[PDB]
Protein backbone atom coordinates (compact mmCIF):
# COMPACT_ATOMS: atom_id res chain seq x y z
CA UNK A 1 0.00 0.00 0.00
CA UNK A 2 1.40 3.37 -1.17
CA UNK A 3 3.48 5.53 1.20
CA UNK A 4 1.47 8.76 0.93
CA UNK A 5 -1.59 6.83 2.07
CA UNK A 6 0.29 5.23 4.97
CA UNK A 7 1.57 8.59 6.10
CA UNK A 8 -1.92 10.11 5.88
CA UNK A 9 -3.21 7.31 8.04
CA UNK A 10 -0.37 7.61 10.52
CA UNK A 11 -0.86 11.36 10.62
CA UNK A 12 -4.46 10.78 11.69
CA UNK A 13 -3.82 8.25 14.43
CA UNK A 14 -1.06 10.56 15.58
CA UNK A 15 -3.19 13.70 15.56
CA UNK A 16 -5.77 11.88 17.67
CA UNK A 17 -3.12 10.84 20.16
CA UNK A 18 -1.85 14.43 20.34
CA UNK A 19 -5.39 15.77 20.80
CA UNK A 20 -5.97 13.41 23.72
CA UNK A 21 -2.58 14.01 25.33
CA UNK A 22 -2.98 17.70 24.54
CA UNK A 23 -6.25 17.76 26.41
CA UNK A 24 -4.71 16.05 29.45
CA UNK A 25 -1.55 18.13 29.53
CA UNK A 26 -3.49 21.37 29.08
CA UNK A 27 -5.68 20.80 32.16
CA UNK A 28 -2.63 19.71 34.08
CA UNK A 29 -0.74 22.87 33.16
CA UNK A 30 -3.64 25.33 33.45
CA UNK A 31 -5.03 24.27 36.86
CA UNK A 32 -3.30 26.30 39.53
CA UNK A 33 -3.42 29.50 37.44
CA UNK A 34 -6.08 31.92 38.76
CA UNK A 35 -8.69 32.79 36.15
CA UNK A 36 -7.75 29.91 33.86
CA UNK A 37 -10.68 28.26 32.06
CA UNK A 38 -8.92 25.40 30.29
CA UNK A 39 -9.37 23.25 33.40
CA UNK A 40 -11.69 20.29 32.74
CA UNK A 41 -11.02 17.41 30.36
CA UNK A 42 -14.14 17.52 28.19
CA UNK A 43 -13.82 21.15 27.15
CA UNK A 44 -10.04 20.84 26.96
CA UNK A 45 -10.56 18.15 24.33
CA UNK A 46 -12.90 20.52 22.46
CA UNK A 47 -10.21 23.13 22.85
CA UNK A 48 -7.40 21.04 21.41
CA UNK A 49 -9.56 19.94 18.47
CA UNK A 50 -10.48 23.51 17.59
CA UNK A 51 -6.80 24.35 18.00
CA UNK A 52 -5.52 21.49 15.88
CA UNK A 53 -7.89 22.51 13.11
CA UNK A 54 -6.59 26.01 13.72
CA UNK A 55 -10.13 27.34 14.13
CA UNK A 56 -9.70 28.61 17.72
CA UNK A 57 -12.94 30.45 18.58
CA UNK A 58 -11.49 32.11 21.67
CA UNK A 59 -14.02 30.60 24.07
CA UNK A 60 -11.12 28.64 25.50
CA UNK A 61 -7.33 29.13 25.48
CA UNK A 62 -4.36 28.48 27.79
CA UNK A 63 -2.94 31.26 29.90
CA UNK A 64 0.10 29.48 31.38
CA UNK A 65 3.47 28.90 29.69
CA UNK A 66 3.15 25.10 29.64
CA UNK A 67 -0.44 25.32 28.47
CA UNK A 68 0.62 27.50 25.56
CA UNK A 69 3.54 25.18 24.89
CA UNK A 70 1.03 22.34 24.72
CA UNK A 71 -1.05 24.53 22.41
CA UNK A 72 1.81 25.06 19.96
CA UNK A 73 2.43 21.32 19.70
CA UNK A 74 -1.24 20.71 19.05
CA UNK A 75 -1.40 23.53 16.45
CA UNK A 76 1.65 22.19 14.64
CA UNK A 77 0.43 18.59 14.73
CA UNK A 78 -2.96 19.56 13.37
CA UNK A 79 -1.39 21.70 10.66
CA UNK A 80 1.16 19.08 9.67
CA UNK A 81 -1.38 16.26 9.70
CA UNK A 82 -3.92 18.03 7.54
CA UNK A 83 -1.18 19.26 5.26
CA UNK A 84 0.16 15.77 4.96
CA UNK A 85 -3.27 14.63 3.75
CA UNK A 86 -3.38 17.39 1.14
CA UNK A 87 0.03 16.17 0.04
CA UNK A 88 -1.32 12.64 -0.22
CA UNK A 89 -4.26 13.84 -2.32
CA UNK A 90 -1.77 15.52 -4.63
CA UNK A 91 0.42 12.45 -5.08
CA UNK A 92 -2.79 10.60 -5.87
CA UNK A 93 -3.99 13.11 -8.47
CA UNK A 94 -0.49 13.54 -9.96
CA UNK A 95 0.07 9.78 -10.17
CA UNK A 96 -3.25 9.18 -11.90
CA UNK A 97 -3.01 12.09 -14.35
CA UNK A 98 0.14 10.39 -15.61
CA UNK A 99 -2.11 7.39 -16.29
CA UNK A 100 -4.83 9.29 -18.17
CA UNK A 101 -1.91 10.06 -20.54
CA UNK A 102 -0.15 6.68 -20.67
CA UNK A 103 2.88 6.32 -18.36
CA UNK B 1 -11.50 34.57 42.07
CA UNK B 2 -15.18 34.00 41.39
CA UNK B 3 -17.53 34.90 44.18
CA UNK B 4 -20.70 32.95 44.71
CA UNK B 5 -23.36 34.86 46.67
CA UNK B 6 -26.12 32.87 48.33
CA UNK B 7 -28.94 35.00 49.69
CA UNK B 8 -31.15 34.72 51.60
CA UNK B 9 -29.01 32.88 54.13
CA UNK B 10 -32.03 31.19 55.68
CA UNK B 11 -35.22 30.13 53.95
CA UNK B 12 -38.47 29.43 55.82
CA UNK B 13 -41.21 27.50 54.11
CA UNK B 14 -44.34 25.42 54.85
CA UNK B 15 -44.37 21.66 54.18
CA UNK B 16 -45.20 20.63 50.62
CA UNK B 17 -44.60 24.15 49.32
CA UNK B 18 -42.17 24.94 46.47
CA UNK B 19 -38.84 26.56 47.39
CA UNK B 20 -35.85 28.15 45.62
CA UNK B 21 -32.33 29.14 46.75
CA UNK B 22 -30.39 31.57 44.60
CA UNK B 23 -26.69 31.61 43.77
CA UNK B 24 -25.09 34.58 42.05
CA UNK B 25 -21.64 34.44 40.45
CA UNK B 26 -19.51 37.59 40.44
CA UNK B 27 -19.01 36.89 36.72
CA UNK B 28 -20.47 34.82 33.89
CA UNK B 29 -19.71 31.14 34.46
CA UNK B 30 -21.95 29.54 31.81
CA UNK B 31 -23.57 26.56 33.47
CA UNK B 32 -20.49 25.48 35.41
CA UNK B 33 -22.36 25.64 38.70
CA UNK B 34 -23.12 22.59 40.90
CA UNK B 35 -25.31 22.08 43.96
CA UNK B 36 -24.53 20.28 47.19
CA UNK B 37 -26.66 19.27 50.15
CA UNK B 38 -25.34 18.84 53.68
CA UNK B 39 -27.55 17.76 56.56
CA UNK B 40 -26.59 18.20 60.23
CA UNK B 41 -23.29 16.32 60.70
CA UNK B 42 -23.15 14.70 57.28
CA UNK B 43 -20.79 15.39 54.40
CA UNK B 44 -21.86 17.24 51.27
CA UNK B 45 -23.99 15.32 48.74
CA UNK B 46 -24.14 16.28 45.04
CA UNK B 47 -27.72 17.29 44.10
CA UNK B 48 -27.43 18.93 40.69
CA UNK B 49 -24.39 19.25 38.44
CA UNK B 50 -23.77 21.74 35.66
CA UNK B 51 -26.66 23.92 36.80
CA UNK B 52 -29.44 21.62 35.58
CA UNK B 53 -28.21 18.06 35.02
CA UNK B 54 -29.63 15.63 37.57
CA UNK B 55 -27.64 13.04 39.49
CA UNK B 56 -28.93 9.50 40.00
CA UNK B 57 -30.28 8.73 43.44
CA UNK B 58 -31.53 12.26 43.97
CA UNK B 59 -35.29 12.71 44.49
CA UNK B 60 -36.89 13.91 41.25
CA UNK B 61 -38.06 16.67 43.61
CA UNK B 62 -34.77 18.60 43.05
CA UNK B 63 -34.19 20.68 39.93
CA UNK B 64 -31.68 23.28 38.85
CA UNK B 65 -31.76 26.22 36.43
CA UNK B 66 -29.81 29.26 35.33
CA UNK B 67 -26.86 30.30 33.21
CA UNK B 68 -24.24 33.02 33.31
CA UNK B 69 -24.42 34.63 36.73
CA UNK B 70 -27.82 33.70 38.12
CA UNK B 71 -28.54 30.13 39.22
CA UNK B 72 -31.47 28.57 41.03
CA UNK B 73 -31.86 25.25 42.88
CA UNK B 74 -35.53 24.41 43.37
CA UNK B 75 -37.28 21.79 45.47
CA UNK B 76 -40.84 21.15 44.31
CA UNK B 77 -42.73 20.16 47.49
CA UNK B 78 -40.38 20.50 50.45
CA UNK B 79 -40.32 17.94 53.22
CA UNK B 80 -38.57 17.30 56.51
CA UNK B 81 -35.76 15.29 54.93
CA UNK B 82 -34.86 18.45 53.00
CA UNK B 83 -33.85 20.36 56.11
CA UNK B 84 -30.15 21.01 55.54
CA UNK B 85 -27.63 23.51 54.22
CA UNK B 86 -27.33 24.03 50.50
CA UNK B 87 -24.18 25.20 48.75
CA UNK B 88 -23.31 26.09 45.19
CA UNK B 89 -19.88 25.55 43.61
CA UNK B 90 -18.38 26.70 40.31
CA UNK B 91 -15.84 25.01 38.04
CA UNK B 92 -15.77 27.65 35.33
CA UNK B 93 -12.49 29.21 36.40
CA UNK B 94 -9.70 28.14 38.72
CA UNK B 95 -9.87 27.84 41.65
CA UNK B 96 -13.21 26.15 42.27
CA UNK B 97 -15.11 28.23 44.81
CA UNK B 98 -18.07 27.73 47.13
CA UNK B 99 -21.10 29.75 48.11
CA UNK B 100 -21.68 30.89 51.67
CA UNK B 101 -24.59 28.46 52.06
CA UNK B 102 -28.37 28.71 52.55
CA UNK B 103 -30.14 26.90 55.42
CA UNK B 104 -33.56 25.46 54.56
CA UNK B 105 -35.94 25.69 57.44
CA UNK B 106 -39.47 24.29 57.57
CA UNK C 1 -12.55 15.19 -17.62
CA UNK C 2 -9.55 14.77 -15.27
CA UNK C 3 -10.00 13.23 -11.80
CA UNK C 4 -8.44 16.02 -9.73
CA UNK C 5 -10.97 18.41 -11.25
CA UNK C 6 -13.87 16.05 -10.57
CA UNK C 7 -12.81 15.65 -6.97
CA UNK C 8 -12.46 19.43 -6.54
CA UNK C 9 -15.97 19.84 -7.86
CA UNK C 10 -17.34 17.06 -5.69
CA UNK C 11 -15.54 18.51 -2.70
CA UNK C 12 -17.39 21.79 -3.27
CA UNK C 13 -20.88 20.38 -3.66
CA UNK C 14 -20.12 18.28 -0.62
CA UNK C 15 -18.83 21.16 1.48
CA UNK C 16 -22.01 23.07 0.69
CA UNK C 17 -24.14 20.13 1.75
CA UNK C 18 -22.17 19.84 4.99
CA UNK C 19 -22.49 23.58 5.64
CA UNK C 20 -26.26 23.39 5.25
CA UNK C 21 -26.67 20.21 7.29
CA UNK C 22 -24.14 21.59 9.76
CA UNK C 23 -26.25 24.68 10.21
CA UNK C 24 -29.40 22.61 10.81
CA UNK C 25 -27.79 20.10 13.15
CA UNK C 26 -26.07 22.85 15.15
CA UNK C 27 -29.32 24.67 15.97
CA UNK C 28 -30.94 21.36 16.75
CA UNK C 29 -28.17 20.40 19.16
CA UNK C 30 -27.64 23.83 20.75
CA UNK C 31 -31.28 24.74 21.52
CA UNK C 32 -32.11 23.48 24.97
CA UNK C 33 -28.71 24.53 26.37
CA UNK C 34 -29.01 27.67 28.55
CA UNK C 35 -26.86 30.53 27.29
CA UNK C 36 -26.31 28.98 23.88
CA UNK C 37 -26.22 31.45 20.98
CA UNK C 38 -25.93 29.08 18.02
CA UNK C 39 -29.74 28.81 17.92
CA UNK C 40 -31.17 30.31 14.72
CA UNK C 41 -30.59 29.00 11.19
CA UNK C 42 -29.29 32.14 9.47
CA UNK C 43 -26.46 32.83 11.89
CA UNK C 44 -25.78 29.11 12.27
CA UNK C 45 -25.11 29.03 8.53
CA UNK C 46 -22.73 31.99 8.95
CA UNK C 47 -21.19 30.07 11.80
CA UNK C 48 -20.58 26.88 9.86
CA UNK C 49 -19.12 28.80 6.91
CA UNK C 50 -16.68 30.66 9.14
CA UNK C 51 -15.90 27.32 10.76
CA UNK C 52 -15.41 25.43 7.51
CA UNK C 53 -13.01 28.10 6.34
CA UNK C 54 -11.43 27.74 9.76
CA UNK C 55 -11.72 31.49 10.37
CA UNK C 56 -13.95 31.24 13.47
CA UNK C 57 -14.29 34.81 14.82
CA UNK C 58 -15.71 33.71 18.16
CA UNK C 59 -18.96 35.64 17.78
CA UNK C 60 -20.65 32.26 17.56
CA UNK C 61 -19.69 28.75 18.68
CA UNK C 62 -21.41 25.60 20.01
CA UNK C 63 -21.43 24.87 23.70
CA UNK C 64 -23.05 21.41 23.68
CA UNK C 65 -21.34 18.09 22.92
CA UNK C 66 -23.35 17.39 19.76
CA UNK C 67 -22.92 20.96 18.59
CA UNK C 68 -19.17 20.64 18.94
CA UNK C 69 -19.30 17.25 17.26
CA UNK C 70 -21.11 18.94 14.38
CA UNK C 71 -18.42 21.62 14.47
CA UNK C 72 -15.59 19.11 14.09
CA UNK C 73 -17.23 17.55 11.04
CA UNK C 74 -17.68 20.95 9.47
CA UNK C 75 -14.06 21.96 10.28
CA UNK C 76 -12.71 18.75 8.78
CA UNK C 77 -14.90 18.98 5.68
CA UNK C 78 -13.88 22.57 5.05
CA UNK C 79 -10.22 21.73 5.58
CA UNK C 80 -10.32 18.64 3.41
CA UNK C 81 -12.29 20.34 0.65
CA UNK C 82 -10.02 23.36 0.39
CA UNK C 83 -6.98 21.14 0.65
CA UNK C 84 -8.33 18.94 -2.08
CA UNK C 85 -8.55 22.00 -4.34
CA UNK C 86 -4.95 22.95 -3.58
CA UNK C 87 -4.06 19.39 -4.52
CA UNK C 88 -5.95 19.78 -7.77
CA UNK C 89 -4.11 23.02 -8.54
CA UNK C 90 -0.85 21.17 -7.98
CA UNK C 91 -1.70 18.27 -10.30
CA UNK C 92 -2.60 20.92 -12.85
CA UNK C 93 0.66 22.85 -12.50
CA UNK C 94 2.76 19.66 -12.30
CA UNK C 95 1.05 18.14 -15.35
CA UNK C 96 1.57 21.26 -17.44
CA UNK C 97 5.18 21.90 -16.39
CA UNK C 98 5.90 18.48 -17.87
CA UNK C 99 4.48 19.90 -21.11
CA UNK C 100 6.54 23.09 -21.14
CA UNK C 101 9.45 20.58 -21.27
CA UNK C 102 8.10 18.02 -23.73
CA UNK C 103 6.54 14.89 -22.15
CA UNK D 1 7.79 32.06 -17.56
CA UNK D 2 6.17 28.95 -16.01
CA UNK D 3 2.40 28.82 -15.42
CA UNK D 4 2.43 27.96 -11.71
CA UNK D 5 4.49 31.09 -11.11
CA UNK D 6 2.16 33.24 -13.20
CA UNK D 7 -0.85 31.95 -11.32
CA UNK D 8 0.85 32.58 -7.96
CA UNK D 9 1.52 36.13 -9.04
CA UNK D 10 -1.99 36.63 -10.35
CA UNK D 11 -3.39 35.14 -7.16
CA UNK D 12 -1.52 37.81 -5.19
CA UNK D 13 -2.57 40.83 -7.22
CA UNK D 14 -6.07 39.40 -7.09
CA UNK D 15 -6.06 38.82 -3.34
CA UNK D 16 -4.97 42.42 -2.85
CA UNK D 17 -7.80 43.66 -5.05
CA UNK D 18 -10.28 41.54 -3.10
CA UNK D 19 -8.91 42.79 0.22
CA UNK D 20 -9.37 46.40 -0.88
CA UNK D 21 -12.81 45.86 -2.40
CA UNK D 22 -13.67 43.68 0.58
CA UNK D 23 -12.80 46.50 2.92
CA UNK D 24 -14.97 48.97 0.97
CA UNK D 25 -17.94 46.65 0.56
CA UNK D 26 -17.83 45.62 4.22
CA UNK D 27 -18.15 49.20 5.52
CA UNK D 28 -20.83 49.85 2.96
CA UNK D 29 -22.83 46.82 4.06
CA UNK D 30 -22.25 47.14 7.82
CA UNK D 31 -23.07 50.86 8.28
CA UNK D 32 -26.75 51.17 9.02
CA UNK D 33 -26.75 48.10 11.30
CA UNK D 34 -26.95 49.12 14.99
CA UNK D 35 -24.01 47.86 17.03
CA UNK D 36 -21.90 47.07 13.98
CA UNK D 37 -18.17 47.76 14.38
CA UNK D 38 -16.91 47.00 10.88
CA UNK D 39 -17.66 50.60 9.87
CA UNK D 40 -14.48 52.51 9.02
CA UNK D 41 -12.13 51.77 6.12
CA UNK D 42 -8.81 51.42 7.95
CA UNK D 43 -9.94 48.76 10.40
CA UNK D 44 -12.09 47.12 7.74
CA UNK D 45 -8.91 46.62 5.73
CA UNK D 46 -7.26 45.09 8.81
CA UNK D 47 -10.37 42.97 9.14
CA UNK D 48 -10.32 41.63 5.60
CA UNK D 49 -6.59 40.85 5.80
CA UNK D 50 -7.02 38.89 9.02
CA UNK D 51 -9.98 37.19 7.37
CA UNK D 52 -8.19 36.37 4.12
CA UNK D 53 -5.37 34.81 6.10
CA UNK D 54 -8.12 33.04 8.02
CA UNK D 55 -6.70 34.27 11.33
CA UNK D 56 -9.81 36.22 12.42
CA UNK D 57 -9.12 37.42 15.99
CA UNK D 58 -12.72 38.35 16.68
CA UNK D 59 -11.99 42.00 17.40
CA UNK D 60 -13.89 42.76 14.22
CA UNK D 61 -16.49 40.86 12.19
CA UNK D 62 -19.57 41.64 10.05
CA UNK D 63 -23.03 41.30 11.51
CA UNK D 64 -25.13 41.95 8.38
CA UNK D 65 -25.94 39.46 5.61
CA UNK D 66 -24.04 41.37 2.90
CA UNK D 67 -21.11 41.94 5.22
CA UNK D 68 -20.89 38.22 5.88
CA UNK D 69 -21.30 37.54 2.18
CA UNK D 70 -18.36 39.85 1.60
CA UNK D 71 -16.52 37.96 4.33
CA UNK D 72 -17.02 34.59 2.64
CA UNK D 73 -15.61 35.90 -0.64
CA UNK D 74 -12.59 37.30 1.16
CA UNK D 75 -12.07 34.04 3.12
CA UNK D 76 -12.27 31.96 -0.04
CA UNK D 77 -9.98 34.27 -2.01
CA UNK D 78 -7.38 34.26 0.75
CA UNK D 79 -7.60 30.48 1.07
CA UNK D 80 -7.44 29.87 -2.65
CA UNK D 81 -4.61 32.34 -3.19
CA UNK D 82 -2.39 30.95 -0.46
CA UNK D 83 -3.23 27.43 -1.52
CA UNK D 84 -2.36 28.28 -5.08
CA UNK D 85 1.09 29.39 -3.90
CA UNK D 86 1.62 26.14 -2.01
CA UNK D 87 0.68 24.38 -5.24
CA UNK D 88 3.24 26.46 -7.10
CA UNK D 89 5.92 25.57 -4.54
CA UNK D 90 5.07 21.91 -5.10
CA UNK D 91 5.31 22.07 -8.90
CA UNK D 92 8.66 23.76 -8.35
CA UNK D 93 9.98 21.10 -5.96
CA UNK D 94 8.52 18.24 -8.02
CA UNK D 95 9.94 19.62 -11.27
CA UNK D 96 13.42 20.03 -9.82
CA UNK D 97 13.54 16.67 -8.02
CA UNK D 98 13.09 15.15 -11.46
CA UNK D 99 16.27 17.03 -12.39
CA UNK D 100 18.36 15.89 -9.43
CA UNK D 101 17.67 12.43 -10.96
CA UNK D 102 18.12 13.17 -14.67
CA UNK D 103 14.87 13.78 -16.62
CA UNK E 1 20.34 16.88 0.05
CA UNK E 2 17.12 17.55 -1.91
CA UNK E 3 15.87 21.13 -2.42
CA UNK E 4 12.34 20.70 -1.05
CA UNK E 5 13.87 19.51 2.22
CA UNK E 6 16.31 22.41 2.33
CA UNK E 7 13.53 24.89 1.76
CA UNK E 8 11.38 23.27 4.46
CA UNK E 9 14.27 23.60 6.86
CA UNK E 10 14.98 27.18 5.86
CA UNK E 11 11.29 27.98 6.15
CA UNK E 12 11.40 26.80 9.77
CA UNK E 13 14.49 28.69 10.88
CA UNK E 14 12.99 31.68 9.12
CA UNK E 15 9.57 31.36 10.73
CA UNK E 16 11.26 31.23 14.13
CA UNK E 17 13.23 34.37 13.36
CA UNK E 18 10.04 36.12 12.25
CA UNK E 19 8.19 34.98 15.37
CA UNK E 20 10.92 36.42 17.59
CA UNK E 21 11.28 39.66 15.64
CA UNK E 22 7.49 39.78 15.37
CA UNK E 23 7.20 39.59 19.12
CA UNK E 24 9.72 42.41 19.61
CA UNK E 25 8.30 44.68 16.93
CA UNK E 26 4.74 44.15 18.15
CA UNK E 27 5.49 45.33 21.71
CA UNK E 28 7.47 48.21 20.29
CA UNK E 29 4.59 49.29 18.07
CA UNK E 30 1.74 48.64 20.53
CA UNK E 31 3.17 50.39 23.63
CA UNK E 32 2.05 53.98 23.58
CA UNK E 33 -1.46 53.07 22.37
CA UNK E 34 -4.02 53.37 25.20
CA UNK E 35 -5.84 50.11 25.88
CA UNK E 36 -3.34 48.00 23.96
CA UNK E 37 -2.63 44.57 25.47
CA UNK E 38 0.10 43.32 23.15
CA UNK E 39 2.70 45.03 25.35
CA UNK E 40 5.00 42.50 27.04
CA UNK E 41 7.44 40.18 25.29
CA UNK E 42 6.34 36.80 26.66
CA UNK E 43 2.70 37.08 25.66
CA UNK E 44 3.66 38.84 22.43
CA UNK E 45 5.64 35.73 21.53
CA UNK E 46 2.57 33.61 22.32
CA UNK E 47 0.61 36.03 20.19
CA UNK E 48 2.86 35.79 17.15
CA UNK E 49 2.96 31.99 17.36
CA UNK E 50 -0.82 31.74 17.47
CA UNK E 51 -0.89 34.23 14.61
CA UNK E 52 1.70 32.43 12.49
CA UNK E 53 -0.25 29.22 12.87
CA UNK E 54 -3.28 31.31 11.98
CA UNK E 55 -5.12 30.12 15.09
CA UNK E 56 -5.57 33.58 16.67
CA UNK E 57 -7.77 33.06 19.75
CA UNK E 58 -8.51 36.75 20.19
CA UNK E 59 -7.05 36.97 23.68
CA UNK E 60 -4.35 39.14 22.17
CA UNK E 61 -4.14 41.25 18.99
CA UNK E 62 -2.52 44.51 17.83
CA UNK E 63 -4.54 47.69 17.70
CA UNK E 64 -1.98 50.03 16.08
CA UNK E 65 -1.13 50.28 12.38
CA UNK E 66 2.46 49.08 12.78
CA UNK E 67 1.37 46.30 15.10
CA UNK E 68 -1.10 45.08 12.50
CA UNK E 69 1.54 45.47 9.81
CA UNK E 70 3.78 43.26 11.93
CA UNK E 71 0.85 40.87 12.28
CA UNK E 72 0.39 40.54 8.52
CA UNK E 73 4.05 39.67 8.03
CA UNK E 74 3.85 37.05 10.74
CA UNK E 75 0.59 35.61 9.30
CA UNK E 76 2.09 35.40 5.82
CA UNK E 77 5.36 33.88 7.04
CA UNK E 78 3.54 31.25 9.06
CA UNK E 79 1.24 30.45 6.15
CA UNK E 80 4.03 30.31 3.61
CA UNK E 81 6.30 28.25 5.86
CA UNK E 82 3.71 25.63 6.69
CA UNK E 83 2.58 25.55 3.08
CA UNK E 84 6.13 25.10 1.97
CA UNK E 85 6.37 22.02 4.19
CA UNK E 86 3.18 20.57 2.71
CA UNK E 87 4.77 21.16 -0.68
CA UNK E 88 7.87 19.32 0.46
CA UNK E 89 5.77 16.39 1.68
CA UNK E 90 4.16 16.27 -1.75
CA UNK E 91 7.43 16.25 -3.68
CA UNK E 92 8.48 13.44 -1.37
CA UNK E 93 5.33 11.36 -1.94
CA UNK E 94 5.27 12.11 -5.68
CA UNK E 95 8.95 11.25 -6.09
CA UNK E 96 8.59 7.95 -4.28
CA UNK E 97 5.35 6.87 -5.97
CA UNK E 98 7.33 7.06 -9.20
CA UNK E 99 9.67 4.53 -7.58
CA UNK E 100 6.99 2.08 -6.45
CA UNK E 101 6.32 1.90 -10.23
CA UNK E 102 9.87 1.84 -11.61
CA UNK E 103 11.21 5.21 -12.83
CA UNK F 1 -31.36 33.44 31.48
CA UNK F 2 -31.75 36.87 29.93
CA UNK F 3 -34.03 39.25 31.75
CA UNK F 4 -36.07 41.77 29.85
CA UNK F 5 -37.17 44.74 31.97
CA UNK F 6 -40.11 46.81 30.76
CA UNK F 7 -40.63 50.02 32.69
CA UNK F 8 -42.76 51.99 33.09
CA UNK F 9 -45.44 49.33 33.42
CA UNK F 10 -48.17 51.73 32.34
CA UNK F 11 -47.88 54.61 29.89
CA UNK F 12 -50.38 57.47 29.75
CA UNK F 13 -50.48 59.69 26.70
CA UNK F 14 -52.76 62.12 24.83
CA UNK F 15 -54.19 61.19 21.40
CA UNK F 16 -51.93 61.89 18.43
CA UNK F 17 -48.89 62.29 20.67
CA UNK F 18 -45.66 60.28 20.20
CA UNK F 19 -44.97 57.46 22.66
CA UNK F 20 -42.12 55.07 23.55
CA UNK F 21 -41.89 51.89 25.66
CA UNK F 22 -38.47 50.75 26.80
CA UNK F 23 -37.09 47.23 27.09
CA UNK F 24 -33.81 46.55 28.84
CA UNK F 25 -31.93 43.25 28.51
CA UNK F 26 -29.86 42.02 31.46
CA UNK F 27 -27.05 41.53 28.93
CA UNK F 28 -26.06 42.52 25.40
CA UNK F 29 -28.34 40.80 22.88
CA UNK F 30 -27.38 42.66 19.69
CA UNK F 31 -30.63 43.36 17.89
CA UNK F 32 -32.25 40.03 18.69
CA UNK F 33 -35.24 41.72 20.28
CA UNK F 34 -38.82 41.56 18.89
CA UNK F 35 -42.01 43.39 19.76
CA UNK F 36 -45.51 42.02 20.25
CA UNK F 37 -48.88 43.68 20.66
CA UNK F 38 -51.80 42.14 22.53
CA UNK F 39 -55.16 43.85 22.83
CA UNK F 40 -57.80 42.88 25.41
CA UNK F 41 -58.58 39.18 24.80
CA UNK F 42 -56.57 38.78 21.61
CA UNK F 43 -53.38 36.81 21.03
CA UNK F 44 -50.01 38.47 20.57
CA UNK F 45 -49.31 40.13 17.21
CA UNK F 46 -45.76 40.70 15.90
CA UNK F 47 -45.10 44.46 15.50
CA UNK F 48 -41.35 44.76 14.98
CA UNK F 49 -38.76 42.01 14.58
CA UNK F 50 -35.03 42.19 15.17
CA UNK F 51 -35.35 45.50 17.00
CA UNK F 52 -36.05 47.63 13.93
CA UNK F 53 -37.25 45.53 10.98
CA UNK F 54 -40.90 46.16 10.15
CA UNK F 55 -43.50 43.47 9.51
CA UNK F 56 -46.02 43.76 6.69
CA UNK F 57 -49.53 44.71 7.71
CA UNK F 58 -48.33 46.81 10.62
CA UNK F 59 -49.21 50.53 10.54
CA UNK F 60 -46.18 52.53 9.40
CA UNK F 61 -46.90 54.28 12.72
CA UNK F 62 -44.82 51.64 14.60
CA UNK F 63 -41.03 51.77 14.67
CA UNK F 64 -38.31 50.08 16.66
CA UNK F 65 -34.76 51.03 17.67
CA UNK F 66 -31.88 50.00 19.89
CA UNK F 67 -29.05 47.53 20.12
CA UNK F 68 -27.22 45.71 22.89
CA UNK F 69 -29.24 46.15 26.06
CA UNK F 70 -31.50 49.12 25.42
CA UNK F 71 -34.42 48.83 23.00
CA UNK F 72 -37.29 51.17 22.18
CA UNK F 73 -40.64 50.59 20.46
CA UNK F 74 -42.16 53.89 19.33
CA UNK F 75 -45.60 54.79 18.04
CA UNK F 76 -45.63 58.11 16.19
CA UNK F 77 -49.13 59.52 16.79
CA UNK F 78 -50.98 57.21 19.17
CA UNK F 79 -54.62 56.36 18.65
CA UNK F 80 -57.36 54.36 20.30
CA UNK F 81 -56.60 51.19 18.34
CA UNK F 82 -53.17 51.24 20.00
CA UNK F 83 -54.56 50.63 23.46
CA UNK F 84 -53.08 47.26 24.39
CA UNK F 85 -50.20 45.54 26.17
CA UNK F 86 -46.78 45.56 24.58
CA UNK F 87 -44.15 42.91 25.16
CA UNK F 88 -40.56 42.46 24.07
CA UNK F 89 -38.91 39.08 23.42
CA UNK F 90 -35.29 38.09 22.80
CA UNK F 91 -33.84 35.30 20.68
CA UNK F 92 -30.18 36.04 21.32
CA UNK F 93 -29.65 33.24 23.81
CA UNK F 94 -31.64 30.17 24.77
CA UNK F 95 -34.25 30.12 26.12
CA UNK F 96 -36.26 32.87 24.45
CA UNK F 97 -37.62 35.14 27.18
CA UNK F 98 -40.35 37.75 27.49
CA UNK F 99 -40.65 41.16 29.09
CA UNK F 100 -43.12 41.86 31.87
CA UNK F 101 -45.25 44.01 29.56
CA UNK F 102 -46.21 47.70 29.30
CA UNK F 103 -49.87 48.80 29.09
CA UNK F 104 -50.54 51.76 26.78
CA UNK F 105 -53.24 53.98 28.11
CA UNK F 106 -54.73 57.01 26.37
K1 LIG G 1 -11.38 34.36 17.91
K1 LIG H 1 -7.14 29.26 10.49
K1 LIG I 1 -8.56 30.98 12.98
K1 LIG J 1 -9.93 32.62 15.37
K1 LIG K 1 -13.26 36.62 21.19
K1 LIG L 1 -14.56 38.17 23.46
K1 LIG M 1 -4.06 25.58 5.12
Curated annotation (Swiss-Prot), chains A, C, D, E:
Per the record, the major location class is membrane
A Gene Ontology biological process term:
action potential
Question: Residue ranges for motif Selectivity filter?
Answer: 54-59
Q: How does it sit in the membrane?
A: Multi-pass membrane protein
Chain ranges on the Extracellular side, renumbered to this chain: 30-40, 60-66
Query: Which ranges does the record mark as transmembrane?
Result: 7-29, 67-90
What intramembrane ranges does the Swiss-Prot or TrEMBL entry report? Answer: 41-51, 52-59
Keywords, A to Z, come to: Cell membrane, Ion channel, Ion transport, Ligand-gated ion channel, Membrane, Transmembrane, Transmembrane helix, Transport
The record's statement on gene disruption is: Cells grow slower and to lower myceliar densities.
Q: Which GO terms describe its cellular component?
A: voltage-gated potassium channel complex
- Compartment(s) of residence: Cell membrane
* Signal peptide (from-to): none
Record remark on domains? The cytoplasmic C-terminus is involved in the gating mechanism.
The record's misc note reads: The amino acids 62-79 are situated in the membrane and are important for channel structure and properties.
The family assignment reads: Belongs to the potassium channel family.
As for what it does, the entry says: Acts as a pH-gated potassium ion channel; changing the cytosolic pH from 7 to 4 opens the channel, although it is not clear if this is the physiological stimulus for channel opening. Monovalent cation preference is K(+) > Rb(+) > NH4(+) >> Na(+) > Li(+).
Fill in the subunit field for this protein: Homotetramer.
What this protein is called in its record is pH-gated potassium channel KcsA
Organism expressing this protein natively: Streptomyces lividans
